[PDB]
């Protein structure tokens, strides 16, 4: 019961009564906190940025004859890693080490991911991963997400082609957070047909490429100038069939507006309009502008007697290119 009120208090963000209560109960032989105890109120702490009262709490611990855990030393690593201390992770852990403490996946992903944001060297990562595989880590699903993640933060050109096929070329993937990060690394090198690959590698993977995915790729596709690549990204978009939001729609149109083929312009809208996906304010602004560069400008008035009758309102840019319109009509 004094766990699961810990719980409740961490989910509502009470730190100060959980404190209280975890000091009073320390005075309390009948209600003497256990390691877990322990380990919720460091947390709890940890949670709210209160690292000198956790530290307190977990030196405390062999005064109460406290037990300590992996657990523990984990807790402590992410929370030094959360505030950017990498350094602070890895003397924690050479320490873990020291008082032969086997370190877990868990404790050994935390300080990958610390030494990640924290921006050490990719070589840094490289030597950690070597000493958990030498000491038998193990794999796990959401590990191996912020693996492929881990070239790359680097950013290398080689890790960022190695953060792709680390999925690809072992045989093991992730159907789609590991396809995101990998294909984001692959962008900034530049994801040659890294990107007909990201998409073609979540979607006949057995799980259907994801919208959203499908449009974070599309979007820098549209920053490389993919075009034709982009067209058959979003006809592969297209292919995909998952469900999307105009959203995805309207960045790639925008792009179009540049090229303006104009009906190519209309021949979208109209799909887009019948799949219940009411063009949103911003794809309206977008449309507008995309007319009006190219003229139309009767067909801007038009569409103000559209946005009404399906009653999504104007915004403030919306207003202004419409006014626009009119001047130039």
């Known amino acids: 019961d004094f766990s699961h009120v810990f719980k409740e208090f961490a989910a509502r963000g009470d730190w100060q009564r959980s404190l209280r ?3 009073y109960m320390q005075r309390q032989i009948w209600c003497k906190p256990n390691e877990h105890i322990y380990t919720l109120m460091i947390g709890i702490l940890g949670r709210e940025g209160l690292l000198d009262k956790a530290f307190e709490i977990f030196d405390e611990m062999p005064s109460h004859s406290v037990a300590r855990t992996v657990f523990s030393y984990t807790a402590i690593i992410n929370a030094y890693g959360r505030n950017g201390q990498y350094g602070t992770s890895l003397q924690l852990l ?8 086997i370190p877990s996946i868990l404790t050994y992903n935390t300080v990958i991911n610390s030494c990640a944001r924290g921006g050490h060297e990719w070589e ?15 794999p796990d699903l959401v590990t191996y997400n912020t693996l492929l993640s881990a070239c790359s933060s680097r950013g290398l050109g080689d890790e960022a082609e190695m953060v792709f096929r680390t999925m690809n070329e072992a045989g093991i993937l992730p159907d789609v957070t590991t396809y995101s990060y990998l294909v984001d690394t692959f962008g900034k090198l530049g994801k040659l047909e890294k990107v007909s690959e990201l998409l073609m590698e979540m979607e006949a993977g057995g799980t259907s490429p994801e919208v959203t995915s499908y449009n974070v790729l599309l ?6 100038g993919s075009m034709k690549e982009a067209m058959d990204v979003f006809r592969q978009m297209q292919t995909a069939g998952c469900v999307a ?3 995805t729609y309207s960045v790639l149109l925008n792009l179009y507006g540049k090229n303006g083929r104009y009906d190519q312009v209309r021949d979208l809208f109209l799909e887009m309009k019948m799949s219940n996906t009411e063009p949103d304010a911003d794809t309206y602004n977008i449309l507008i502008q995309v007319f009006g560069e190219g003229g139309y400008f009767k067909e801007v008035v038009t569409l103000f007697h559209d946005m009404v009758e399906e009653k999504v309102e104007p915004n403030m840019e919306t207003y202004e290119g419409l006014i626009y319109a009119c001047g130039k009509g």
Do not use: C, P
């Not at 050479?94 to 403490?101: D, F, L, V």
């Not at 840094?124 to 193990?138: P, Y």
């Not at 979007?219 to 490389?224: F, I, K, M, V």
């Open 94 to 101: 050479e320490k873990m080490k020291q008082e032969k403490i």
């Open 21 to 23: 209560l975890f000091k």
């Open 219 to 224: 979007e820098a596709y549209a920053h490389s």
């Open 245 to 247: 939001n105009a959203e």
């Open 124 to 138: 840094g990562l490289l030597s950690l991963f070597a000493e958990m595989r030498h000491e038998g880590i193990q």
